[PDB]
């Protein structure tokens, strides 16, 4: 057996309230910088899908 | 012209028996490798078509014969140098080419193909 | 993964008819009566005509494939499960395919019987300008193995010639996944939201 060099979650992160960009005032990009997880157009579409307007809000 | 350097003009040229009577005359062209000695051989075995066999001091040869531009220049006189051969331009009656052929050994299958 | 001595005998006997299949199909597409020999000079000239055309080679590949795949189906139908040494419910390899836990009878047949005809982009194995499918095979060889038909199984192993053919099939499967609904769904969702 061979042990592969990659950590299982090297991309393991958690953010409550971290730093934000000046222009958008939205969570800044960067795991180590206490950055935010992006909720993209497809996740927006899925939240519209469930008819779950407060989850989208 | 005069050029190139180290080249001397050919003054003496040996006689060529050219007549072209009629029981007729035949002009032959032969190709030979540098390895074989022409002055050593006093007899050349040759037959019609591509089929030929020759062996001169361990080395084996084959005389390829083909039916069918090259121009033959025959000396009329030693002082007249060289002139184009004609009867009525001239072409060779029979053209031959000596090719060195080597005998490739038969594969010893009983020794190489093993279960 | 093992077949019984009885079951393995059936496998070798059905696969013994596959040697003729290669030349039989090659003689059918070429249109030659009494089934001409594999080394026939007119047949070899006729197969060359097929080699130079993409459509003609397609007719040859589809005919030979259907015929060798019929030999594959026969092996699988006979040997699995009536020829397997260990049988269901104890044969776990067989059990997982039948239960729907993991795998299918196709995977089971590649393991215990044969890999079959290695199909590349709907056709057989690619062939060189010389008429050779590999430097090991004869130019314009009328054999199923030369076309990519693997008689070997993963339990017994694949013959070096067979293994190279399998690799071509494997790589082709991988590239299509990498190369090939994001924009199609995005266009509908923005107009239907």
């Amino acid at each position: 057996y061979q042990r592969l060099r990659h950590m299982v979650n090297d991309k393991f992160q958690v953010r409550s309230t971290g730093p934000v960009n000046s222009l958008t005032m939205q969570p800044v990009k960067g795991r180590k910088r206490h950055g935010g997880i992006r909720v993209g157009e497809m996740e927006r579409d899925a939240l519209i899908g469930h008819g779950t307007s407060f989850l989208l809000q | 012209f005069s050029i190139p350097d180290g080249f001397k003009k050919c003054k003496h040229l040996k006689n060529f028996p050219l007549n072209g009577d009629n029981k007729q005359q035949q002009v032959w062209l032969i190709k030979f490798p540098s390895n074989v000695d022409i002055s050593k051989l006093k007899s050349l075995p040759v037959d019609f078509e591509s089929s030929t066999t020759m062996t001169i001091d361990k080395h084996d040869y084959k005389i390829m014969d083909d039916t069918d531009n090259m121009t033959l220049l025959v000396p009329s006189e030693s002082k007249e140098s060289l002139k184009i051969a004609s009867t009525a331009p001239l072409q060779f009656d029979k053209v031959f080419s000596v090719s060195e052929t080597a005998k490739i050994p038969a594969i010893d299958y009983s020794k190489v193909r093993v279960p | 993964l093992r077949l019984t001595a009885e079951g393995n005998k059936w496998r070798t006997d059905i696969l013994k008819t596959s040697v003729d299949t290669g030349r039989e199909a090659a003689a059918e597409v070429t249109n030659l009566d009494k089934d001409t020999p594999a080394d026939d000079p007119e047949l070899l000239k006729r197969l060359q005509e097929i080699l130079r055309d993409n459509n003609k080679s397609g007719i040859l590949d589809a005919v030979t494939s259907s015929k060798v795949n019929a030999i594959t189906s026969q092996v699988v139908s006979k040997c699995v499960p009536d020829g397997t040494m260990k049988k269901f419910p104890c044969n776990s390899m067989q059990a997982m395919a039948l239960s729907g836990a993991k795998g299918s009878n196709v995977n089971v047949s590649q393991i215990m019987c044969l890999l079959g005809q290695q199909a590349l982009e709907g056709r057989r194995v690619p062939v060189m300008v010389s008429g050779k499918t590999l430097p090991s095979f004869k130019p314009y060889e009328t054999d199923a193995m030369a076309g990519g038909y693997v008689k070997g199984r993963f339990y017994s192993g694949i013959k070096p010639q067979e293994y190279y053919f399998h690799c071509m099939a494997g790589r082709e499967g991988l590239i299509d996944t990498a190369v090939k609904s994001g924009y199609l769904q995005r266009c509908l969702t923005k107009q239907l939201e």
Partner: protein, 105 residues
């Protein structure tokens, strides 16, 4: 069928020069042969009122191949062999030796 040879000449006498397909010439002009001293290289040169002929031997062909020309008898069945060099001959015209300025604009 073994054919006998009467005489062999290792001295310059008769030569062969290839031009192109369909070469006639006036058939009254002369061709001056030259020699350089393992293997000897030959140079051919001719002159005419409107044309000029120039020939030479291939360096890669001379050291590797030895060409010979012979005359055959229909009754005696004997060949008289004479060594002949093959000269790659080109023909230059009156139109040649024409050129413009070394540097134009």
């Amino acid at each position: 069928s073994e054919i006998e040879i009467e005489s062999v000449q290792d001295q310059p006498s008769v030569a062969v020069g290839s031009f192109f397909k369909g070469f006639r010439a006036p058939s009254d002009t002369t061709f001056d042969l030259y020699k350089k001293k393992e293997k000897d290289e030959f140079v051919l040169h001719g002159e005419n009122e409107r044309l000029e002929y120039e020939g030479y031997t291939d360096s890669s062909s001379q050291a590797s191949n030895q060409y010979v020309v012979g005359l055959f008898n229909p009754e005696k069945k004997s060949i008289q062999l004479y060594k002949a060099p093959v000269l790659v001959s080109k023909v230059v015209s009156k139109s040649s030796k024409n050129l413009r300025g070394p540097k134009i604009k």
